[PDB]
Enzyme design. Sequence first.
Site, PDB file in Angstrom:
ATOM      1  N   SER A  56      44.627  19.460  39.736  1.00 18.94           N
ATOM      2  CA  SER A  56      44.889  20.766  38.770  1.00 18.94           C
ATOM      3  C   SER A  56      44.137  21.681  39.076  1.00 18.94           C
ATOM      4  O   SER A  56      42.812  21.574  39.441  1.00 18.94           O
ATOM      5  CB  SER A  56      44.835  20.178  37.314  1.00 18.94           C
ATOM      6  OG  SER A  56      44.463  21.351  36.666  1.00 18.94           O
ATOM      7  N   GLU A  57      44.674  23.205  39.444  1.00 20.14           N
ATOM      8  CA  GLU A  57      43.720  24.056  39.895  1.00 20.14           C
ATOM      9  C   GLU A  57      42.632  24.496  39.320  1.00 20.14           C
ATOM     10  O   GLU A  57      41.778  25.014  39.580  1.00 20.14           O
ATOM     11  CB  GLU A  57      44.822  25.326  40.326  1.00 20.14           C
ATOM     12  CG  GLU A  57      45.642  25.777  39.187  1.00 20.14           C
ATOM     13  CD  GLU A  57      47.163  25.465  39.356  1.00 20.14           C
ATOM     14  OE1 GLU A  57      47.616  24.287  39.516  1.00 20.14           O
ATOM     15  OE2 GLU A  57      47.857  26.647  39.671  1.00 20.14           O
ATOM     16  N   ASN A  58      42.749  24.342  37.910  1.00 23.95           N
ATOM     17  CA  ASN A  58      41.578  24.635  37.012  1.00 23.95           C
ATOM     18  C   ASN A  58      40.489  23.704  36.923  1.00 23.95           C
ATOM     19  O   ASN A  58      39.329  23.947  36.325  1.00 23.95           O
ATOM     20  CB  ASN A  58      41.969  24.831  35.656  1.00 23.95           C
ATOM     21  CG  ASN A  58      42.576  23.580  35.225  1.00 23.95           C
ATOM     22  OD1 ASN A  58      43.547  23.069  35.733  1.00 23.95           O
ATOM     23  ND2 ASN A  58      41.991  23.162  34.031  1.00 23.95           N
TER      24      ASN A  58
END
Lengths: 214, 216, 212, 214
Positions: free
Chosen positions: C49-51
């Site tokens: 997940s990019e966060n």
Amino acid sequence: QKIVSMEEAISHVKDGMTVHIGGFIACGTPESIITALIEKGVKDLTIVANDTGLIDKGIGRLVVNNQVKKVIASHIGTNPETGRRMQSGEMEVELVPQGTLAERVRAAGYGLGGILTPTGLGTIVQEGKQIINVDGKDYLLEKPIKADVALIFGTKVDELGNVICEKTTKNFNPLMATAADVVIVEALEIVPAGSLSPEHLDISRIFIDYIVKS
Amino acid sequence: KQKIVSMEEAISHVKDGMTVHIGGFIACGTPESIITALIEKGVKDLTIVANDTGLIDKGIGRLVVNNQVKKVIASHIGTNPETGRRMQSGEMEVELVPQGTLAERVRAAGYGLGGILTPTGLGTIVQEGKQIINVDGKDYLLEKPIKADVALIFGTKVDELGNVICEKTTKNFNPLMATAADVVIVEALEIVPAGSLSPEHLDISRIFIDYIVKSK
Amino acid sequence: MEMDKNLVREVIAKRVAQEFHDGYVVNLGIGLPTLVANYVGDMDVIFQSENGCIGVGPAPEKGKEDPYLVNAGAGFITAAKGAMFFDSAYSFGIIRGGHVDATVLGALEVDEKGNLANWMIPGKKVPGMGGAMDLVVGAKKVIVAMEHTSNAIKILKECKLPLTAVGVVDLIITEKAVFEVTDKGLVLKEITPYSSLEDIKATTAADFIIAD
Amino acid sequence: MEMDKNLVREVIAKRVAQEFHDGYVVNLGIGLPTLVANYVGDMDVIFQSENGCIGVGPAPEKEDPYLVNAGAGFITAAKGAMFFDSAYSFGIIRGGHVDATVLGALEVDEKGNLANWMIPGKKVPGMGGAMDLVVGAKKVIVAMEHTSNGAIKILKECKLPLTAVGVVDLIITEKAVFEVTDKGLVLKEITPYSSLEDIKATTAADFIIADLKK
């Protein structure tokens, strides 16, 4: 599944390869992997490392054993054999400023095409470098360094490949682990999978291909 | 020890026209109490560098609605219709930055680099107005560093010296923008004693933090 | 007559899950591709997940929800065994550096040169690229999972909408077809019992060829 | 008649330590600059070592080999220290978060140029972190013997290979303290061990006089 024998691991370090080796004056160097490669006798290596260690400790053991064609490092003063092989013409050595070396290894791992640094300007490091002007100031274009294999070290490694490099054994290890095709970590201790907190890690599992014990 | 201060003294360093880094990924990791204090103070004309503009009622978006923001540099403005509105009218300016690129551009000002080369954006509108550098027959975009006047960041645990821990997904841009601003304010969920936190488990070092505030 | 949206999402999602293998690092975008999470069964897929998470876990049981632990759409998640949380520069060295084995995204248009448009409709919807350019530029396998039509032809000869990346898309997966993008161009590789090559021909604007 | 070495080093080290303030982040180079730590006392200084420690503590009694400094010697972690990889370390250094760095020099010149990593043919250790340190450090202090076996080190233009260009802020010797400004060198101090006529005859660069503390 990722845990293998030392002989299985060093089967991937083949002649002529460029090799990242973690370690700051052998602090955080995989010494067991190194001695194995002293036994295998692999030749014509290009070692990418902070330094060349000592003649009796670390990457230096590869140097004195005629196993290193070229060295890409920031410091070689602690190993007078590197010095000797450099002046004699045997070994080629690119002396890279340490911060530049970090960003250059990191750039290979992170998909960057290069980084702009002011370190180097007006010195020997500038030679062979493109100068980019950004908002009036001049920078050196320093290029990524991908390697074939990274030999990294972890004071603790869980069975999936998550690595912990404690105290000052971090160095380039967590950078090098992103910037090679085959990453081998030499574990001091193999903890169980999940034993290590998602918050306390230095290198994710998705970077490690093979784990070996020291 | 000297660093923990009043919110009233903290926001005394956020002044009109200043470029501000604000942490937070859709307000997860936004210093919300700092955001509220800045809404009482009424600081006008800011430029906000953040991952997103939150929601019109959470995080950075509260500043956008309260007409406190002249320009936004962000990766995502979709969960805030007020950003989209002001963008299309002209009342606000918006630079839409690929998220990896924004991490790198903020990091660059923090780490002393003069720019980074990314392949992200070649062929698209983000390429407009950007140096294309060729490195060994592959083109890249020169993306420039983004220094801020102040950074407002969030920590789930800050020790008295300034060492910050951001737990789970609250390290968004926080460790990056803490390095990339002249003055750095961390809003602390909790304030543990100096040294309480382990040298291995940190996310931002004391040496970046100027002021600690407790979350009101 | 248009299909039941849930059934198109289901056939697309299930087909994407066939493209992974045990150990794949996979990034799924918000919307259709998040459902691919349900058909991965017992594959050893690691979701990213990019966060700032590698090893995303399933949503938490109501009452154990953490707003300090969300995913890229800000929805509550847990942390699978062996996960790691990180800042977003590290997050995007994973993405841009070729360590995401497959990213699955949806698309407004997609063409035969491999270009992708999916982040902006000029004047109508402008959300920002988010992590999407980085993902498609950097991922090893770019899988576009989408409705074959939206009402309007989406698989074109050359995209007309604002581009996301040039020359990224590797696989196109619709309710009708499985297209592969190669240097020759689009290559029809599969047809679903919900369509026939006669149907694909008049809902696809790009010229393409056929395998065996 | 050349002074007593251990006394020269102490005159310098004790005068460098006055350049610090509470909360300063300081990097000390290997050699004479390391002594500067015996004289900081309770000044609240935070020491950084290139290999990845912020908040370097004093040496341990009788000694962890996984926690050392930029010159391989055993150290300890102070209260509130962090441990990090080489890229983070040089973000701190290259990005201006080090308030002062203390370094030796082979040559320094009136423009603030520095030569201190290489003597052609004679000693080539590499630049280590020094290029990054003098370019990024907020204040750059050269702490050196005024002469090397009688040869003049402070010149109008350096002749040896540069470390960096226009970075030196302060030159501190056992004879003098110079400030490097836009117009040239400015003699700010004269020690009990030398005189103006002495400095003038052991300094090749032209300079002007301060405010001068004699």
